[PDB]
Design a protein around this nucleic acid. Sequence first.
RNA 1: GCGCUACACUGACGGAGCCAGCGAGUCUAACCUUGGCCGAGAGGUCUUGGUAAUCUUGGAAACUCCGUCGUGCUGGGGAUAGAGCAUUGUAAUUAUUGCUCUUCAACGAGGAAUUCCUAGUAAGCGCAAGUCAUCAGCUUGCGUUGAUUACGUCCCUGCC
Lengths: 140, 142, 115, 64
Amino acid sequence: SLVVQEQGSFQHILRLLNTNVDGNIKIVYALTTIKGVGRRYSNLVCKKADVDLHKRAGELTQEELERIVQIMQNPTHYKIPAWFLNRQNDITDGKDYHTLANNVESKLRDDLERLKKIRAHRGIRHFWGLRVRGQHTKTT
Amino acid sequence: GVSVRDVAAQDFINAYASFLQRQGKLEVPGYVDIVKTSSGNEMPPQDAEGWFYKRAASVARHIYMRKQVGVGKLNKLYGGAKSRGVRPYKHIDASGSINRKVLQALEKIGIVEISPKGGRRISENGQRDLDRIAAQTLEEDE
Amino acid sequence: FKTHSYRGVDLEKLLEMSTEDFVKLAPARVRRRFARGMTSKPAGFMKKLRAAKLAAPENEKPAPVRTHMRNMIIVPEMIGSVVGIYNGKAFNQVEIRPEMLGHYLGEFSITYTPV
Amino acid sequence: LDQEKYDRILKEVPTYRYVSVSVLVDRLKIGGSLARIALRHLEKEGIIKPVSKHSKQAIYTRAT
RNA sequence: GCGCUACACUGACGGAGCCAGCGAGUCUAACCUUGGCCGAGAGGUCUUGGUAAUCUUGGAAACUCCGUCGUGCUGGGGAUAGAGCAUUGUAAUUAUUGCUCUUCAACGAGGAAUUCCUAGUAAGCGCAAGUCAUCAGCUUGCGUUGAUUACGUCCCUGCC
């Protein structure tokens, strides 16, 4: 409807989970320069959140940074339907949970090294550097 | 004298959509913002909204256009192919759910009805409510 | 230090338990394995697991069983058992566990060589 | 998006004859996402008089 | 070696118009499933019909619509990744697939080569079958849009 007069609280690069973000990019992404989140947990944490889906990554009230660091990380509460998921049943600690940013990188990790203690064939064929899904790959 | 046919295929869409947006009666089922409609769409509907009030004039104009049909029919219609990616592109039949529930909500007022043979037939009201509102969408064209 | 609590669910009951019990607690596949072609898997292993775990002195591992059921499951009553499996020719044995529990048997036995 | 991007826009886009959104990224450079906005806004008697169709091209133009 | 998407505004995203044809299909048991709900979704299911011009099944995509994007490796490119949530499968690990959101890899029209093609023909947008519990970037078959270029020679190869 117009060019919106963005004052500077347009602030021009952003930081969400230590893990970089850019600040005049159209949001749902930006939440996608991340691990473990991608335009589907992202278009829920914005609908269960009081959001814009067309705002940028710099243009962020902060009451919409800390509620959007927050649903994330929680999972079951602002209706997160649990099929929606990756840490689908822990199976070591159940649980209904989300594997995140720094954390999908050290849990990718801790799922291989409950089946390399074993000595089986879902994390021994990851072990020879060659693939486990059953195929003949030679070409690649 | 003044038809549903005599009028275009997205003005009736957006001018029954802002009729069934601004009716309140319409009910609005609980997996109708989130959940992906269709499974080859990644994107649900870009409205998230009262696609439900844009699927409430589609469905509905779509009935009346023919005899009868639905839910495993509005199942072959609303989707398209598949995004299989790499695998030469492939049809996928939606989710009977949302319109198995607008078809039991339209059942409510007197717009859509259950055609004997059975399954969705618009009533006798209903049509009354589409020839009132194909003549109120003919005068945004006139 | 903090022991493998199998799904703390709080080993304690994942040490020595039914066949109803963990019939449920496996990941999707297995539901469709204890309940499909259920009989005739252990017509006589859980009855040579119970002849083994059971003819020892315990703590000396027991006298090796035989088997070609690489198609059996890992359950919370075969905890310790000893087990010995056809890769097509010879009986490769295996340490049997609380953290092998829900996982595939003879994945383990490695058949085919690699290099 | 600051306030010598919309008033460079409106004093430059009344008699500015041929326009689009490839016209505001090559003349006013940054954006596009936004641009199909501060063009279209209104449509006050003094912005653009069009022979534009759908979505897929928006070919606008001169009030006079 | 056989192949899929793309280097764009003659496109990518979105509403709103919104269109066929080849099939198939459950019996001694779980093949097709709507409808009407529950799920953002992927789905779940109640229940329904159908041994089928009788059901799912008349609604597939390229497109016209109405525009946002504006010459920004992007709002072309969709690589590789982190988790979750689902849907099958005694076994999902060398994630069968799917969703949910973010990580945003090359390549800015493809050298020495070298194919296939004279009419609804070249080629692209789909889909139903053949696998099958599933997993198609293949095999087969169809149509819906559909032109260039000759309609001739023995320069060549090849064989008569």
